[PDB]
Design a protein around this nucleic acid. Structure first.
Lengths: 349, 349
RNA sequence: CGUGGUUGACACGCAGACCUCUUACAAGAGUGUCUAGGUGCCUUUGAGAGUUACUCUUUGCUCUCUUCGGAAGAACCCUUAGGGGUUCGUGCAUGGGCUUGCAUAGCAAGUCUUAGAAUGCGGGUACCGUACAGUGUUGAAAAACACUGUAAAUCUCUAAAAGAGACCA
């Protein structure tokens, strides 16, 4: 079990109640992890590669991971104009990308679930729980959780934008979840779920594994936004476009803080290949391999590793990791049609 | 149609867009009526008998009436502690109550429908509507739709309590109703729904048929309260119970305003019996029969009809109205069991 | 913006931008490309009636003549030629004196300029260069002529928002 809490804790930067997670790993042989995915259009890299890495870490630890294709969450946030069929197409696109990028679906440990079909099948189990969470939480607590949706508390929130935390908190218990492996922004609704467990006196509270929020490619972008395609790497971005964005990616010399390129390295590459090789001419210090992020940041700050070397090796490696998905969507006809339809849709706020 | 227009109009104290109502009666041979009521315990007279009078008078106009069994909604309001089983038992109690009191169901024009059952059978049709109502209306408007559960906007609100108004407003297009026969009390959510569709630019708003809110037997009670059985005559109340409640009922001499006995006559006896007979000794002016309410008020204000004579006649007529219910619940085993269980349930605020 | 070409084509002095390559946004290379807007007016404007649980208001969708003349320009019907019957096209806030809150002059307000087209702004209305899709011609490439359109391609093809009068979990 020791390696296991290491393997899983490596999934998220923030882990609440580490001892209880250890207990769960020790006692219940196949913990169930989940994350929610609103199909809101083209999905950027932090969504694909980092999550594939995380789910692979979990399944290698023996965890069952449920990928919640949260369609009504997408409509509740008026994605795609709230269109059922476009949203279904986008979800199929996402599943295809995950299969292509190297997600261990064939392992039999990853199950992709639709909120509409699944919840439609057990409405009686769910809706009472939503009513209960909604009843046991005043409005203000629900509104504070709006950041799960990407909306501030000052946003004019539709009453559905008020219910949304209720359903998303409920899914935690609907799905009988053990580990909430999600992003930072899901932290408020996850705490809503624990305080609900406190209200309903369920001893077994869910473990919380909140993941690092991958920044946008431009300076000061705490997170990639689908609204700025140049600031977000899309998993279907082409070789040249990878290159262009990266070149345009912010990467000040000797400055690690707020330097996105180093962060994407840290959270994608070293997790992907265990090391980062910067290929350099003999005159400029020759080829160099970074097996760890500390070595990379040291060589970056000292000035031995300049951004002009990081970014090219960086985009090289990014295009490498992305090439299999390019090949899949070039080869698979249904995936190709899904890609064309998804790019044919307008991104909505 | 003018006959139909008058008949339907007489049901409610306030009838709105009378032009639209006349148009509907002329163009739709069988317009759709309904009532939504939380099964929250013992049935008092204003809720049973007045509703029976209105629904029967409407069905004689050829109208179809859908009685909305508000079990899921009642659970939203925590009736019987929100226990759906007790809610269902109370609903069966109330249905057999209407049957005993003289509903025209055998005419095939009255329909009892279950909110939980129908919503589950057509949840795909329902839930989107509630969402939409949530969207097009801010929080403040839905809280302004608070009353249809009862409290003012100031009392503490949970999120389920915010589902409720939009859920009723969705009931509208869920039921395909053209005229909504309910009390004055459904009003601000009524325009919640008109605003809803003005926004969708549909073409035909349904009519309201607002029933008078019957006061309690005590001074200053603008409406009946089940929290006060002493101010509430229950349709299963024995002759002694009715007589005592009427005796303690507020009825100042020569004062018509706020005299619940007079409104009780107006809305139960004259509508039910077409007349009101006050039995008095030859010395006390002898028996007098009131066919119209104005004659009753003229004699009452002039002092010829004293409360000592009005109250016994009121109690006699009310007991006459309630005797069929007593006989039904005395003879029918299932009705008697339902009565036992409903009386056994603590009316939960 | 100018140049030689009288002129269309053809090249040059400056900017910008679309695409590629590099490159840390920056920055640098490539002529593959393009780059004037006008001629014309209207458009601040009675009321009511309707937009799937009340009224009304701030706004939006439909029915009667569509307020200083209101269908501006267009289109449909009929003509000796002058004309006529019909439809569509319905923009939004302020002033300026009038007096005050202010010793008169910000901002607003009680009044009018049906609208001082005055101050700010879009849409439709023919023509033109431009560019392309389509026709016919001159045309060996290129270029050009005339018509439809676009230049702000296109629209809630109906998921129009808010506000004031009430009985809860």
């Amino acid at each position: 079990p020791e390696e296991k809490f290491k393997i899983v804790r490596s999934v998220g930067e923030e882990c609440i109640q580490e001892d209880e997670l250890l207990n769960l790993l020790t006692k219940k042989p196949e913990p169930v992890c989940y994350d929610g995915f609103e199909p809101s259009g083209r999905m950027h890299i932090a969504q694909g590669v980092m999550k594939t890495i995380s789910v692979n870490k979990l399944t290698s630890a023996g965890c069952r991971v449920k990928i919640w294709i949260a369609d009504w969450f997408a409509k509740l946030n008026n994605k795609m104009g709230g269109d059922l069929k476009k949203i279904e197409t986008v979800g199929r696109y996402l599943i295809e990308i995950w299969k292509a990028v190297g997600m261990d679906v064939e392992g039999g440990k990853v199950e992709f679930l639709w909120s509409s079909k699944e919840i439609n099948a057990r409405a009686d189990e769910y809706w009472p729980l939503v009513l209960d969470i909604a009843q046991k939480n005043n409005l203000k607590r629900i509104i504070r959780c709006s950041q799960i949706m990407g909306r501030s508390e000052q946003d004019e929130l539709t009453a559905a934008q008020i219910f949304y935390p209720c359903m998303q908190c409920a899914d935690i218990f609907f799905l009988k979840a053990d580990i909430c492996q999600l992003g930072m922004d899901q932290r408020k609704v996850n705490v809503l779920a624990r305080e609900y467990c406190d209200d309903i006196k369920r001893k077994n509270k869910p473990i919380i594994l909140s993941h690092h929020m991958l920044p946008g490619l431009q300076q000061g972008q705490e997170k990639m936004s689908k609204s700025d395609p140049s600031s977000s790497v899309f998993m279907e971005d082409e070789e040249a476009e990878v290159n262009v964005k990266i070149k345009k990616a912010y990467c000040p010399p000797k400055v690690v803080e707020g330097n996105p390129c180093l962060e994407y390295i840290k959270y994608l590459i070293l997790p992907w290949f265990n090391e980062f090789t910067v290929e350099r001419s003999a005159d400029n210090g020759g080829n160099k391999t970074f097996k760890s992020y500390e070595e990379l940041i040291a060589d970056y700050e000292s000035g031995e590793l300049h951004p002009a070397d990081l970014k090219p090796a960086l985009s090289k490696s990014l295009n490498k990791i992305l090439e299999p998905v390019r090949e899949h969507f070039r080869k698979d006809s249904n995936a190709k049609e899904l890609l064309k339809r998804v790019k044919a849709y307008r991104v909505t706020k």
